[PDB]
Write a structure and sequence with these properties.
The PDB classes it as electron transport. The entry lists the keywords respiratory chain complex, mammalian mitochondria, membrane protein, electron transport. The entry is titled "Closed Complex I from murine liver". Chain A: NADH dehydrogenase [ubiquinone] 1 beta subcomplex subunit 5, mitochondrial. Organism of A: Mus musculus. This is part of a larger assembly, with chains A and B. By secondary structure, chain A is mainly alpha-helical. Chain A has one helix spanning 3-36. The N and C termini of chain A lie far apart (83 Å). Chain B has helices spanning 21-26, 28-34, 36-48. Chain B is 46% helix and 0% strand. Chain B is mainly alpha-helical. Chain B has three helices and no strands. The chains are: A mainly alpha, B mainly alpha. The A-B interface holds A 57, 61-63 and B 43, 46-47, 50, 52.
């Protein structure tokens, strides 16, 4: 087919691989930041459930 | 932290009922029928404001 086919295919491959490398580095940074200070979706460690707390009036008023 | 604010003995002074438990239980039902409104107000303030110092009156 000629040299331009291989040339532009190589350009497309290089663009894909460079984008993948940048995405992997960004993913590493995102994971590190979330694990250090969990405020995104990931690394959300559990917490006791709020809905299982009694709020009805009880025997002792000092609650 | 901050110090705790609690009232003095003059604020806690009242004419206590020097009445035994058998006497109270004998007069229990009529005391619960006649003095009901003040008692229910005190229980409402105690169960709303958990602090006992807000209900001395």
């Amino acid at each position: 087919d000629g040299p331009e086919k291989n040339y532009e295919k190589t350009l497309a491959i290089l663009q894909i691989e460079s984008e993948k490398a940048e995405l992997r580095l960004k993913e590493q940074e995102v994971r590190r930041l979330m694990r250090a200070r969990g405020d995104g979706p990931w690394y959300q460690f559990p917490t006791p459930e709020k809905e299982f707390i009694d709020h009805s009036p009880k025997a002792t008023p000092d609650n | 932290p901050g110090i705790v604010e609690l009232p003095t003995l003059e604020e806690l002074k009242v004419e206590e009922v020097k009445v035994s438990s058998a006497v109270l239980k004998a007069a229990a039902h009529h005391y619960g029928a006649q003095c009901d409104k003040t008692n229910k107000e005190f229980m409402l303030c105690r169960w709303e404001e958990k602090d006992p110092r807000r209900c001395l009156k």
